Amino acid sequence: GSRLEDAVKKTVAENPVVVYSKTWCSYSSEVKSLFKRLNVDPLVVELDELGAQGPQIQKVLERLTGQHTVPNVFIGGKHIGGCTDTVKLYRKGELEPLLSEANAKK
Ligand SMILES: *SC[C@H](NC(=O)CC[C@H](N)C(=O)O)C(=O)NCC(=O)O
Numbered sequence: 001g002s003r004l005e006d007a008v009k010k011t012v013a014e015n016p017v018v019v020y021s022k023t024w025c026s027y028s029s030e031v032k033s034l035f036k037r038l039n040v041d042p043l044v045v046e047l048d049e050l051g052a053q054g055p056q057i058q059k060v061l062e063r064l065t066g067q068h069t070v071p072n073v074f075i076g077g078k079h080i081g082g083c084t085d086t087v088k089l090y091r092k093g094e095l096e097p098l099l100s101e102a103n104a105k106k
Pocket of ligand 1: 027082084
């Protein structure tokens with residue numbers, strides 16, 4: 001449990017943009033599209049493709065972020081929120097500078 005938390009923390013530190021996702025979730029597909037449009041290639045972890053580990057990672061995500069929904073977006077090692085939250089940062093003009101500070105590749 002503490003190792004899983006540690007692994008999540010490393011994941012978000014190793015990658016400019018991380019999206020914890022589920023393949024079927026429209027909001028997740030939507031935030032992935034936004035990143036595609038902004039020429040970012042995030043690390044996408046599909047919780048529904050992880051079997052038993054999926055619910056385990058989500059437990060950790062809820063502890064670290066306060067959020068129980070997907071997508072769970074991180075940029076530059078920092079929790080952003082979900083699709084709607086990410087889109088808010090975009091509309092406000094704050095998203096691209098964050099992606100730059102995170103050195104988002106592509
Ligand atoms: S599609 C799966 C569900 N996601 C959302 O409802 C995300 C909405 C947010 N406002 C956003 O990301 O934009 C989901 O995670 N359902 C699980 C549940 O417990 O409701």
